[PDB]
Amino acid sequence: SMSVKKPKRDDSKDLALCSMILTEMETHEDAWPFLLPVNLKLVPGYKKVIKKPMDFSTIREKLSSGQYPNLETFALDVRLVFDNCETFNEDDSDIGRAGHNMRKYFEKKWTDTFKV
Ligand SMILES: Cc1ncccc1N[C@H](C)CS(C)(=O)=O
């Protein structure tokens, strides 16, 4: 509360670490469904069904222009990618399993990197 400060972690390296994590995501062989925005004119239903589309290139732009206030908002967008993927694709479709794989890959890196 007012004049009662909680010890807070060093966040000075968060931007650089989030960037390195995103790069590893981008270079994963199963990253191909998530590199660019889903083409709304090509995929029937996506615009109507998915209220908040997200992809790695959009995350990369937001990260590169100071649109993430903190690392938690960054993880929210990353998880949004895979949440959207689960909504629209069957679990054992090529795109569907890519999403499950990529989510698992992200969460371990997240823990290994920040949750010390
Ligand atoms: C991730 C996702 N989710 C739902 C449908 C498609 C996709 N990914 C596609 C590769 C994008 S497209 C078909 O090139 O426009």
- CA–centroid distance, 2 to ligand 1, in Å, is 48
In this structure, the residue with its CA closest to atom 8 of ligand 1 is 33
Number of domains making up the chain: 1
- The CATH number assigned to the domain holding 84 equals 1.20.920.10
Calculate how far, in angstroms, residue 62's C-alpha sits from the geometric centre of ligand 1.
20
Write the DSSP assignment of the chain as a string of letters. Answer: -TT-PPP----TTHHHHHHHHHHHHHTSGGGTTTSS---TTTSTTHHHH-SS---HHHHHHHHHTT--SSHHHHHHHHHHHHHHHHHHS-TTSHHHHHHHHHHHHHHHHHHHHT--
Question: Atom of ligand 1 at shortest distance to CA of 84?
Answer: 3
Domain interval for residue 38: 1-116
Distance of alpha carbon 108 from its chain centroid, rounded?
13
CA of 72 to the centre of ligand 1 (A): 25
Residue among 43, 82, 94 whose CB has most ligand 1 atoms within 8 A, to mutate: 43
